[PDB]
């Protein structure tokens, strides 16, 4: 009920921003307003002959760096390191899941099992494990771990999951020098290329940026997605709820934050132990309430139906409620300001990873061999914090909103009858004109979820099915769009298909790493049709992205032949040639390009224009 309303579209955010304003708590929006004044990407710090800056000064000076690099090279090198940082996040995510499966195969991970033995055999046989369908599971698991570790090596010509792509798409990557060879190798070669006096050509630098992101989507992310299903079960459609109202004043509230489900799944298992449940009652709690934040919340939402408290810009406001008893975090997108805001209350801020360290946090390092023991200790710290909660400062806003989740590729095919042919024929008729994966973050520079939900409504109204992943899940869920009754907000053709299957017009497909499910579905549809991915009526969008990670997702979507839209532009506008390559040049190279547009309705026209063109290229109506 102030200028706070210009920061978010949701009521629970307005209620907590007013509560933070009264209690004198600075939020991300406050710090974003101070850092309002390097956005052109024409500043280089790669060596101490600089730092250099490229300008169009009237004197003609500062046109080149000290080494002689121009604006094209400097912008390309900064952009490549931007993509590499995003690929490195998904790289360690998949690597931690590889190490967890190996620990299960060796019997050294108490509490972890192989939840989906059927998927273990199918994935292993697909990647080349001999007799994967009939050998003992732990032996099959060990061979799959070897293949995955070799993709984090330096001897392969191409990643294992790259075989899912159509043949014409693989033959295109090979001719371009774009085929990803190793998940860690392409990250290291990107840092090598952007060193002084190495790669000084903006075209080859951008080609390697696509190759690095392809090592993310078809490598690190896809390995992380498929091993999570093997270790924790393949997600199936199920109902749950979102927004801050999922917190309970009468229960211990444990907020899991981060990305890796290896930690959050064992936290949930610890809260269900009888001795731990009894201890929560001794503290006077009716139950232990686990709620999810960001991607690790998407993980528990897809496989366990655990309610989600919020997304990126909601994590601070979740502690302002005064009901957060513990924040369990591993790594990625955990703003360090959470530690200071948790100090204002009783909230116990716990970190679990050697990579996710925070100055002033309670560190309980979790590993596969002691996860079951350490997570029990973590839940006890939450129960203890419940005893010290300040009752006069608890104000859980709003009421929870119903959602439906768990739409993996296996679940989508099961609703279709085990075959993509019903989905194809619906696209042939003209009921579903195309698919668009809406993915990405929030960003304080844009009213929270305003562009995410707007584009989602515009697309489903034009008979375009939306595949939601990442923090957009919270945006779509709180808009009432993740239920089968949301078909009334879709066009006539899409609504008829949704009511036939009992599914919503927006399918939740998981966390950010689960964007590999979209690649898997796009590769499966292009394979059955016999065409390239650049021929399918597909699209991708990140209207409110912020991280290096979303840029890497957008990059490997473009490199795979999916026209990708970005709300805010990357720090590349200081070079017209790099800008012309990203926006127009890539269209000839890989069959897709980036789209920068802050207007979500206009972006719906551009996404639909690409889709109708690809429908024409298929000779469809």
Interactions with a second copy, residue window 333-372 (CB under 8 A): 333-338, 340, 354-359
- What are the structure tokens assigned to 250, written together? 């009468």
CB of 95 to a second copy, least distance (A): 6
Instruction: Confirm if 583 and 49 have CB atoms less than 8 A apart.
Output: no
Site for a second copy in 275-334 (CB under 8 A): 331-334
Among 33, 49, 580, 601, binds ligand SF4 (CB under 6 A): 49
Binding track, positions 47-86, relative to a second copy; x by CB under 8 A: xxxxxxx-------xx-xxxxxxx-xx----x--x--xxx
Residue 523 or residue 554: which is nearer to ligand SF4 going by CB?
A: 554
Q: Does 596 bind a second copy (CB under 8 A)?
A: no
Task: Give the three-class secondary structure for 562.
Answer: coil
Instruction: Confirm if 365 and 330 have CB atoms less than 8 A apart.
Output: no
Among 105, 114, 127, 183, binds a second copy (CB under 8 A): 183
Across the beta sheet with 308-310, the strand order is 308-310, 288-293, 252-257, 326-329, 348-351, 362-363
CB of 138 to a second copy, least distance (A): 18
Task: Report CA torsion sign: 90, 96, 97, 99.
Answer: positive
Among 91, 311, 456, 511, binds a second copy (CB under 8 A): 91
Among 15, 16, 69, 313, binds ligand SF4 (CB under 6 A): 69
Among 33, 38, 62, 66, binds ligand SF4 (CB under 6 A): 66
CB of 548 to a second copy, least distance (A): 6
C-alpha neighbours within 13 Å on the C-beta side of residue 211: 27
Among 4, 67, 283, 596, binds ligand SF4 (CB under 6 A): 67
Q: Does 191 bind ligand SF4 (CB under 6 A)?
A: no
Q: Does 560 bind ligand SF4 (CB under 6 A)?
A: no
155 makes contact, choosing from ligand SF4, a second copy, none, with CB < 5 to 8 Å by partner type, with: a second copy
Taking the C-alpha atoms of residue 592 and residue 539, their distance in angstroms, rounded to an integer, is 9
Q: Does 51 bind ligand SF4 (CB under 6 A)?
A: yes
Give the bridge partners for 448, in sequence order: 8
Q: Does 7 bind a second copy (CB under 8 A)?
A: no
Taking the C-alpha atoms of residue 301 and residue 31, their distance in angstroms, rounded to an integer, is 31
Residue with the two structure tokens 């009921």: 431
Report the alpha-carbon angle 352-354-357, nearest 5. 75
CB of 198 to ligand SF4, least distance (A): 10
Binding track, positions 491-530, relative to a second copy; x by CB under 8 A: ----------------------------------------
- Other beta carbons within 10 Å of 343: 12
The region, left, alpha or beta by phi > 0 then psi within -120 to 50, assigned to residue 325 is alpha
Residue 11 or residue 70: which is nearer to ligand SF4 going by CB?
A: 70
Give the bridge partners for 351, in sequence order: 329, 363
Q: Does 199 bind a second copy (CB under 8 A)?
A: yes
Residue 9 or residue 441: which is nearer to a second copy going by CB?
A: 441
User: For residue 251, what is the DSSP state?
Assistant: S
Taking the C-alpha atoms of residue 90 and residue 213, their distance in angstroms, rounded to an integer, is 10
Site for a second copy in 129-158 (CB under 8 A): 149-150, 152-155
To which H or E segment does residue 181 belong? none
- What are the structure tokens assigned to 284, written together? 């006077």
Site for a second copy in 442-471 (CB under 8 A): 443-445
Interface positions with ligand SF4 (CB under 6 A)? 44-47, 49-52, 65-67, 69, 74, 196
């Amino acid at each position: 009920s102030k200028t706070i309303r210009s920061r978010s579209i949701w009521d629970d955010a307005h209620a907590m921003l007013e509560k933070a304003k009264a209690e004198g708590i600075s939020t991300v929006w406050d710090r974003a307003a101070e850092q309002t004044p390097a956005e052109l990407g024409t500043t280089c710090r790669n060596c101490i002959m600089g730092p250099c800056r490229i300008a169009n000064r009237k004197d003609g000076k500062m046109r080149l760096g000290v080494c002689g690099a121009d604006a094209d090279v400097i912008v390309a090198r900064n952009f490549g390191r931007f993509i590499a940082g995003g690929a490195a996040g998904h790289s360690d995510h998949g690597r931690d899941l590889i190490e967890t499966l190996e620990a299960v195969a060796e019997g050294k991970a108490p509490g972890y099992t192989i939840r989906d033995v059927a998927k273990l055999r199918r994935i292993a046989a697909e990647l080349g494990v001999a007799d994967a369908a009939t050998r003992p599971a732990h032996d099959v698991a060990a061979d799959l771990v070897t293949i995955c570790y070799n993709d984090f090596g330096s001897r392969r010509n191409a990643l294992a999951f790259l075989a899912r792509a159509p043949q014409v798409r693989r033959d295109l990557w090979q001719r371009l020098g774009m085929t990803p060879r190793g998940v860690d190798r392409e990250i290291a070669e990107m840092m090598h290329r952007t060193h002084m006096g190495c790669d000084n050509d903006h075209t080859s630098l951008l080609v390697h940026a696509a190759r690095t992101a392809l090592a993310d989507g078809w490598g690190g992310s896809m390995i992380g997605t498929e091993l999570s299903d093997i270790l924790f079960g393949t997600p199936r459609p199920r109902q749950s709820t979102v927004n801050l109202g999922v917190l309970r004043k009468d229960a211990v509230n444990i907020l899991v934050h981060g990305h890796n489900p290896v930690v959050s799944e064992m936290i949930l298992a610890a809260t269900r132990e009888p001795a731990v449940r009894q201890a929560a009652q001794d503290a006077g709690a009716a139950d232990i309430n686990v709620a999810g934040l960001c991607c690790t919340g998407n993980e528990l939402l897809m496989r366990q139906g655990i309610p989600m408290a919020g997304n990126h810009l909601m994590t601070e406001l979740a502690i302002v409620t005064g009901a957060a008893d513990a924040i369990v975090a591993d790594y990625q997108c955990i703003m360090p300001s959470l530690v200071q805001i948790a100090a204002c209350y009783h909230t116990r801020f716990v970190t679990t990873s050697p990579k996710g360290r925070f100055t002033g946090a309670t560190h309980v390092e979790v590993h596969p061999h002691n996860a079951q023991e350490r997570c029990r200790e973590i839940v006890m710290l939450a129960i203890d914090a419940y005893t010290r909660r300040d009752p006069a400062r608890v104000d859980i806003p709003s009421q929870p909103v119903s959602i439906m989740s768990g739409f993996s590729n296996e679940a989508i095919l099961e609703a279709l009858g085990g075959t993509p042919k019903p989905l194809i024929d619906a696209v042939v008729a003209g009921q579903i004109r195309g698919f668009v994966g809406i993915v990405g973050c929030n960003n304080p520079k844009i009213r929270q979820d305003s562009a995410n939900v707007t584009l989602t409504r515009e697309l489903i109204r034009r008979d375009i099915m939306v595949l939601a992943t990442g923090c957009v899940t919270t945006a779509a869920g709180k808009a009432g769009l993740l239920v089968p009754e949301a078909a009334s907000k879709a066009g006539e053709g899409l609504a008829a298909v949704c009511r036939s299957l009992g599914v919503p017009p927006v399918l939740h497909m998981g966390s950010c790493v689960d964007n590999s499910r979209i690649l898997q579905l796009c590769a499966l549809l292009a394979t059955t049709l016999g065409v390239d991915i650049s021929d399918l009526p597909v699209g991708a969008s990140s209207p409110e992205w912020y991280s290096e990670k979303a840029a890497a997702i957008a990059m490997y979507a473009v490199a795979s032949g999916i026209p990708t839209h970005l709300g805010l532009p990357p720090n590349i506008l200081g070079s017209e040639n790099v800008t012309a390559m990203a926006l127009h040049g890539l269209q000839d190279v890989v069959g897709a390009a980036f789209m920068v547009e802050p207007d979500p309705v206009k972006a719906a026209d551009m996404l639909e224009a690409h889709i109708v063109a690809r429908r024409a290229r298929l000779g469809l109506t």
